[PDB]
Amino acid sequence: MKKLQIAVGIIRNENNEIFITRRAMANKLEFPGGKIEMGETPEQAVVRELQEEVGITPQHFSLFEKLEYEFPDRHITLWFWLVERWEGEPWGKEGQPGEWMSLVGLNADDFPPANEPVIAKLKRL
Numbered sequence: 001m002k003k004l005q006i007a008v009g010i011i012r013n014e015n016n017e018i019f020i021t022r023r024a025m026a027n028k029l030e031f032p033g034g035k036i037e038m039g040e041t042p043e044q045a046v047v048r049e050l051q052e053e054v055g056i057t058p059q060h061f062s063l064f065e066k067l068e069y070e071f072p073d074r075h076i077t078l079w080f081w082l083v084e085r086w087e088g089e090p091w092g093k094e095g096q097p098g099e100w101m102s103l104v105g106l107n108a109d110d111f112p113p114a115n116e117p118v119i120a121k122l123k124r125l
């Protein structure tokens, strides 16, 4: 039994827009994120992952949602962090250009199914 945990960043600006990436579900939207390494905490992981993939250092953030998946010999945990303040400007730092999408025009169906409960929550408030 081993764990695989993913730190996910929900970067939201002042205009209720979120920074998302598009995939080449050939065009579904996704949140930036990556694996939490051994010896690294969930908070340290989302900061590092965003610094590496998006070019920002999250300063003000909180746990927005936590999803668990139990498969044979593997437990998966997705940590979704709502990032409201940061240093830097999001961009395709490692070739993964993202884009700002307003929540008013976003549909959960545009994201892979795992994101459903997160999008619903984002659009409520």
Ligand code: NA
Residues within 6 Å of the ligand: 034, 035, 049
């Ligand atoms: Na990574």
